[PDB]
Amino acid sequence: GLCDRFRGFYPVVIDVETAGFNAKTDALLEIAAITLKMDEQGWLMPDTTLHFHVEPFVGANLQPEALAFNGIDPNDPDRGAVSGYEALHEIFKVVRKGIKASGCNRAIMVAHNANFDHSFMMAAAERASLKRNPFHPFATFDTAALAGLALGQTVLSKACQTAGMDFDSTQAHSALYDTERTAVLFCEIVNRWKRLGGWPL
Amino acid sequence: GLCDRFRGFYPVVIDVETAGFNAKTDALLEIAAITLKMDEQGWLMPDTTLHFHVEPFVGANLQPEALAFNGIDPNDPDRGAVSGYEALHEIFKVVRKGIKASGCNRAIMVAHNANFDHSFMMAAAERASLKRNPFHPFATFDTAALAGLALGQTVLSKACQTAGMDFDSTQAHSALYDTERTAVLFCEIVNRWKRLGGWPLS
Ligand SMILES: [Co+2]
Ligand SMILES: [Co+2]
Ligand SMILES: [Mg+2]
Ligand SMILES: [Mg+2]
Ligand SMILES: [Mg+2]
Ligand SMILES: [Mg+2]
C-alpha cells in the first residue's frame, strides 16, 4: 500500500550528524532511520526506528564548528559508536525487509535538505564498499521543498511549527529527534494532501 | 506575493545538459532558465526564459554515453556555444533583477531531481570564480519530490502526463523543452495546492 502511493518507492526518513559539510572528506558521526507505514485508512505514519552513533572513518576530517554545532564528542569513550559499515548494514537490513513485504521495489530517502544526508549516506556506503544499497542512487524526497509547497516554510523548525507540530529547539540537532520530527512532518504533508482531496487523483 | 509564498525565495526553474553525471569533471553543455511570476489573483506562471549553449570548459571530460543521450555535438561550430561564465552571468543578471523587484531575498533553484542541476550550476560558478550567486547554496525545490507528493509520480514525462500536461518525448532531453515542461509542472503543483484550499494556510 505504501508502494502504490509513490510508484513503488519505499520512503525512509534519514538524518545524519557529521563533522562537516563535505560528504567525501568529513566524518559521519551519527545516523537515524525511520521507516513508514500506511494504515487501512490510507494514512501515513512512522513504522520502525533505528539509530547508530558512527565512528569517524579512518582518515576522516573533523571540523570543530560542526562538533560545536552538533555537540558530539567523537572521543567520548561510551558513545557506543560503530563503524559506518555496521550502521548502514543494519539499516539496510531493515529497509530491505520492509520493501518486499509492502510490494515496493526500491527505497527512497526522505530527508530535510535531502541532498545533504543522501550524499553522506552514499559516501559512507562507498567507503565501506557496500554492494547492496536499497536506496535510490539519486532520487530523494526533500522535506524542505515539500514544506515550501505545503507550508510556505523551508526551515525544519519553522515548518514543523507551521504544520501545528511541537518542536523543541533544545532537542533539535540530535539525530533521533530531528529524524522523528522530519518523519512526522513528512507524514503530515502527505496526509494533508489526501485530506484536502488531492489524493487519490 | 511571489516572495510571500516561499518565505522570500525567488523560484527559478533550471535545466542543464551535460557530458556526464560528474558535476566536477564533466562538461556543462547547455543551460536554460525560466523565472516565475504570480498574478494579482495569486496564481503562478512562467515569466522570463533564457537559454545558452555552453562550451565544454578547458580540461572537461566528455562521456560519449551522455552525448549519445542528449544528442549534443560539442564540435558543431554552428552551435553558438558560450563560456560557462557568460551563461551564468547573463542568467544571474536577470535573476538578480527579479529578486529585488518582488521583495525577494534569495533565488532558489527549481529542477527535476534538482540536486543534479544544482551541483552542475555550482560547479560552473566555481570554475568561473563567480562571486555573486543569487541562488541558495544548498536548498532547492526538487520537482521529482514535489510530483511524488502531488501526482504519485517521480519521472518527469510521467508526472507531466499525470498532471494533464502535454508531453512530447521527441522534444525531451533538450534544455529549453525540459525547462519549460518542468516550469509548467511546478506551477501546476503549486496552483493545484491553492485550488484545493491548501494555500493560504488561514
Ligand atoms: Co563512515
Ligand atoms: Co563551465
Ligand atoms: Mg539534518
Ligand atoms: Mg541534526
Ligand atoms: Mg534534467
Ligand atoms: Mg534534459
Q: How many CB atoms lie within 10 A of CB B97?
A: 13
CA-nearest of B169, B173, B126 to B32 is B173
Does residue A43 sit in helix, strand or coil?
coil
**Chain A positions in Cβ-Cβ contact with residue B8 (cut-off 8 Å):** none
Residue of B nearest to A190 (CA): B149
- Has A173 been annotated as catalytic? yes
Task: State whether the Cα torsion A160-B193-B118-B148 is positive or negative.
Answer: positive
Q: Which domains does chain A have, with CATH numbers?
A: 1-201 (3.30.420.10)
Distances from the Cα of A65 to the Cα of A113, A117, A187, B137, B192, angstroms: 19, 18, 32, 18, 42
Resolution in angstroms comes to: 1.7
Strands B106-111 and B9-18: parallel
Chain A residues interacting with chain B (CB cutoff of 8 angstroms):
4-7, 9, 108, 113-116, 118, 138-142, 144-146, 148-155, 158, 162, 189-190, 192-193, 196-201
Distances from the Cα of A48 to the Cα of A11, A83, A118, angstroms: 12, 21, 19
Instruction: Tell me which residue has cell 519505499.
Output: A10
CA-nearest of B201, B154, B164 to A152 is B201
Q: Could you tell me if B26 and B124 are in contact, meaning their C-beta atoms sit under 8 angstroms apart? A: no
Phi, psi of B70 (to 5 degrees): -90, 0
Contact B6 A190 (CB under 8 A): no
Residue A181 CA to ligand 1 center (angstroms) comes to: 24
The secondary structure element, H or E, covering residue A179 is helix A175-195
Out of A51, A89, A136, A173, pick the active-site residue.
A173
Amino acid at A189: I
Cell (9 digits) for A84 = 559506518
Determine the Cα–Cα distance for residues A13 and A49; give it in Å rounded to an integer. 9
Strands A28-38 and A9-18: antiparallel
Cell (9 digits) for A126 = 562507498
Determine the Cα–Cα distance for residues B139 and A154; give it in Å rounded to an integer. 8
Determine the Cα–Cα distance for residues B87 and B29; give it in Å rounded to an integer. 11
Q: Could you tell me if B60 and B27 are in contact, meaning their C-beta atoms sit under 8 angstroms apart? A: yes
Determine the Cα–Cα distance for residues A15 and A159; give it in Å rounded to an integer. 16
Technique behind the model: X-ray
CA-nearest of B200, B185, B192, B191 to B38 is B191
Distances from the Cα of B17 to the Cα of B62, B166, B174, angstroms: 12, 22, 8
Chain-centroid distance, C-alpha A197: 27
Secondary structure, 3-state, chain B = CHHHHCCCEEEEEEEEEECCCCCCCECEEEEEEEEEEECCCCCEEEEEEEEEEECCCCCCECCHHHHHHHCCCCCCHHHCCECHHHHHHHHHHHHHHHHCCCCCCEEEEEECCCHHHHHHHHHHHHHCCCCCCCEEEEEEEEHHHHHHHHHCCCCHHHHHHHHCCCCCCCCCCCHHHHHHHHHHHHHHHHHHHHHCCCCCCC
Distances from the Cα of A127 to the Cα of A82, A88, B21, angstroms: 14, 11, 20
Ligand at shortest distance from the CA of A117:
3
Residue A7 DSSP code: T
Instruction: Tell me which residue has cell 544499497.
Output: A133
Instruction: Tell me which residue has cell 510571500.
Output: B4
